[PDB]
Amino acid sequence: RYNGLPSMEILGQAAPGKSTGEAMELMEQLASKLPTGVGYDWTGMSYQ
Amino acid sequence: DGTMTQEDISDYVAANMKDAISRTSGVGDVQLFGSQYAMRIWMNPNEL
C-alpha cells in the first residue's frame, strides 16, 4: 500500500545514454495509457 | 449529473479523499460534513 491505497512498486533505470528525467517522463506517458482508476506516484529517490 | 445522493457523496469523500487530505502538508484536523458508509443492519423487532 502507498499513502493508504493499494499499490505496486516498480523499479527501473534510464537506458544507457538517456537521462533519468527522460525515463520518468516516458513512464508517466505509459502510465497515462492504463485502465481507468489506475494512478501513479514517485517515491524514494524519485520523490527526491 | 444526478447520479449520486448526498449520502453517496459523503461516502466518496470519507473513503477516497479524507485520509489523503488529512495527511497533506500543513493540515491539522479534518472534519467530515457527513458520514462514511457502514454496513447497516436495520432490525425489525416484530420479525425477531
Side-chain angles (χ1 to χ4, degrees):
Chain A
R1 304 177 73 84
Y2 192 76
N3 280 334
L5 299 174
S7 59
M8 286 175 186
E9 196 187 5
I10 299 176
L11 310 181
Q13 67 198 35
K18 309 291 301 191
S19 85
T20 310
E22 291 187 278
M24 294 179 74
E25 189 190 347
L26 179 52
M27 284 301 293
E28 304 192 353
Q29 287 178 352
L30 306 177
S32 74
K33 302 303 184 181
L34 294 173
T36 309
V38 179
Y40 72 89
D41 210 346
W42 293 105
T43 194
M45 77 193 89
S46 295
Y47 185 102
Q48 222 72 20
Chain B
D1 77 353
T3 50
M4 297 161 76
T5 69
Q6 192 177 41
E7 277 236 280
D8 279 328
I9 299 169
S10 283
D11 176 80
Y12 185 81
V13 179
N16 301 267
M17 308 174 73
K18 188 184 164 202
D19 287 351
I21 292 296
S22 79
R23 284 186 246 102
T24 300
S25 179
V27 172
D29 191 40
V30 186
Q31 172 71 43
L32 173 74
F33 292 125
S35 186
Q36 187 177 232
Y37 281 158
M39 179 61 56
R40 282 291 190 160
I41 308 299
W42 301 113
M43 304 179 291
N44 177 326
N46 294 338
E47 277 168 349
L48 285 168

